[PDB]
Write a protein that binds this ligand. Structure first.
Ligand SMILES: Nc1ncnc2c1ncn2[C@@H]1O[C@H](CSCC[C@H](N)C(=O)O)[C@@H](O)[C@H]1O
Length: 284
């Protein structure tokens, strides 16, 4: 691999400072669950900092199988953060999520009508929304997914939200569509050439923004450069057992996390955290 020297990785899509023409030419065990757990630990730990997580109910739509969620719940539980978890999915969840009084498992495909019923039952408690719903998917599938996610926000009115965000590819465009305002958080350990990110919103009332076909091209080119060039560098100045970019990226995400244990160095804290995550997910 190519070596490089960085002060920080790209955390949000806007920071990508170069593009590359997509080329059609296209590793870790349970990498999907690792990718989710990191982005959700990041998003939730940022809510912990703003003090809006304590006393909240996390509503996770499309959570099945959700093996990683058991690590989230344990993490904040051991931190003393009071959280209620409600995991709603058509498919069955990982049985590792069984027997937890603060985790409610719901087997159902959410529609507008049901979204109103869970809002009425949770109101006026703080709701935090996490959506990973997906119906390969077509641009029509994505458009329906993103329309449902919008309905999620307008009805559930969460204090904050994390939404699956992958723009349709320009050569599969259909129409302009709208998505919420938010920060486009990049995902370490995503599939080699995935252009998917997490749209993180903290609502002060939401505002929608139009996504055009020229935006689809910007996404394609920036994500390709990120996946082809950036994510294939070794950060030679980084002080860590593994210097590959994705670990550099993971490192910066993990240092926002809270810990009950005290460590002599930030590096020791990240190292302990990374091992704990990997051991639970069965990753060498
Ligand atoms: N309307 C809907 N309501 C609930 N779940 C939905 C849905 N549409 C799609 N899904 C779910 O979206 C999921 C996409 S994959 C989800 C992965 C999950 N976050 C994990 O932790 O492993 C599927 O499990 C599918 O059942």
């Amino acid at each position: 691999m190519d070596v490089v020297s960085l002060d920080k990785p790209f955390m949000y899509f806007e920071e990508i400072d170069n593009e590359l023409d997509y080329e059609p030419e296209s590793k870790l065990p349970y990498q999907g669950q690792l990718k989710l757990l990191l982005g959700e630990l990041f998003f939730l730990s940022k809510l912990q900092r703003h003090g809006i997580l304590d006393g909240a109910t996390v509503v996770y739509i499309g959570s099945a199988p959700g093996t990683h969620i058991r690590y989230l719940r344990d993490h904040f539980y051991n931190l003393g953060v009071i959280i209620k978890w409600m995991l709603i999915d058509g498919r069955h969840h990982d049985p590792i999520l069984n027997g937890l009084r603060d985790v409610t498992l719901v087997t159902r495909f959410v529609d507008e009508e049901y979204l109103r019923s869970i809002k009425k039952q949770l109101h006026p408690s703080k709701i935090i929304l996490i959506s990973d719903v997906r119906s390969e998917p077509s641009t029509a599938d994505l458009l329906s997914n993103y329309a449902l996610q919008n309905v999620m926000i307008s009805i559930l009115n969460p204090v904050a939200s994390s939404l699956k965000w992958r723009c349709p590819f320009p050569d599969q465009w259909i129409k302009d569509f709208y998505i919420p305002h938010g920060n486009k958080m990049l995902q370490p350990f995503a599939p080699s050439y995935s252009a998917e990110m997490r749209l993180l919103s903290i609502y002060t009332n939401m505002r929608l923004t139009r996504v055009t076909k020229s935006d689809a091209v910007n996404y394609e080119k920036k994500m390709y450069y990120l996946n082809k060039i950036v994510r294939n560098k070794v950060v030679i100045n980084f002080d860590y057992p593994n210097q590959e970019y994705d670990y550099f990226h993971m490192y910066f995400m993990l240092r926002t996390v809270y810990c009950n244990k005290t460590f002599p160095t930030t590096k020791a804290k990240i190292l302990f955290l990374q091992q704990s995550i990997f051991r639970f997910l069965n990753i060498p």
